Subunit: 136 residues, 4 copies
């Protein structure tokens, strides 16, 4: 069961080599997790203004085949693990058009749920609405 | 005596055509105005963490010659006009290396000083430190 | 102003990486969106031109402009509405309305303009080429009004 | 004299366009900075390789990684400190410390890693090429030690 974020590669994501510059794959992880929040946990999205922080702990990408301008890429996100305050997600980046389905890359990211009164910020349980959305 | 912001073109600013993607020239206006504040208006720089915001009203670029990866570009900023709450700046983008000095592009931008209130962003006076810095260091 | 556009529409959802500490969309992103919009237009309405862009054709930006009216925020749905202003041998002048369509009422965030030249990479640098017929026809049919 | 090996230092000042509404540096910018750092390294220490990158040589990223420890802010002066982890054939593994050096006390913001492969454009694809001697030479001055 994966969450699909659809992304069309633009010229500004390419580079003189002719492929998608590597760092854009990490932005797409972000676009995907944020679109998930908006689609299935809007209350957590709203809570980000209040006092909830979703902080990136780490991220990773493995690159397999080159993406090009106008490629339609599915950024397929899965829950790898939820533990107290941390959420680990994994990502397949699959070109679905043009040509045959092609795995361009894979990735991983961990996010921590924090609350931040005073000066520092402290771990808080993954919110219920988010925990609920994540299981589906 | 324009204010000079030096920028080395990186691969992530290029594109498959082989040149600097046009929209990066606009980011460089931002980089240049921020570097200007750190150099010449550090009190204003501090107010930007304390509720002051520089809000873009308009911007413009004219492109003359292609930029490439590893080009050293001088983003040369000049003050065009100050009013109550607005600053108009102009920019020459000059490749200084490799090869001979080459005007790649020119640009313009108007910025407003704003503070965030209950309704949203509201106009405030340009701080005197910034008006003086621009009149002295970007003319 | 209107929910319904009369122009070519490129839909864009604002992401967190397009915001900045002020809390709005950083101004330079609006210029990227002109590029995203014109590329989406090619894929929708001039796919033969899209293919020529891998075969020596280049769209070179001559100039661009934006006027900013109201702030954009993360997760705003923005319509980047593109209209043909002028077609002149090898140059295309296009205008843009940036309309927030959600949340809240339709709001003009910004307007913009851009001139692009159709060029081919040659043994002289870049050389002007006439606007491809497919693109000229697509712009007259999909980006007028 | 220097027990710990030196690292290559790429200086980066955080700009507003690298921040986000949360108020910190958006995480994906740290990966761009690896790119900026490795390119600045080539311009400083392997300029012949830098020229070959306009002449058909390409550095192709195989993988990359970042661990985030403390928030970066607009106007922070960040040193992106690069070291060679290993050179394995046509592949180069580099590691990165991201250290805020101003304002305030030196602060480790993040660490990172990246593997790159040296390739050349053949047809419509790329093929492995040996790491150029100049680049091998330049990276070995910043080797991580056991
Ligand atoms: C099955 C997929 C589950 C995905 C869970 C996604 C969680 C994403 C959290 C995103 C947080 C983003 C935070 C900011 C500040 O950008």
């Amino acid at each position: 069961d994966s969450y699909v974020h659809r992304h069309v590669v633009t010229f500004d994501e390419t580079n003189l080599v002719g492929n998608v510059y590597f760092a854009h794959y990490l932005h797409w992880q972000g676009h995907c997790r944020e679109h998930f929040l908006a689609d299935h946990a809007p209350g957590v999205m709203a809570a980000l203004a209040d006092g909830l922080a979703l902080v990136t702990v780490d991220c990773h990408a493995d690159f397999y085949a080159e993406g090009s301008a106008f490629d339609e890429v599915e950024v397929r996100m899965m829950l790898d693990r939820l533990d107290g305050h941390r959420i680990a997600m994994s990502f397949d980046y699959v070109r679905v058009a043009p040509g045959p389905p092609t795995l361009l890359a894979q990735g991983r990211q961990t996010v921590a749920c924090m609350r931040r009164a005073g000066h520092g910020l402290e771990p808080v349980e993954v919110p219920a609405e988010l925990r609920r959305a994540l299981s589906r």
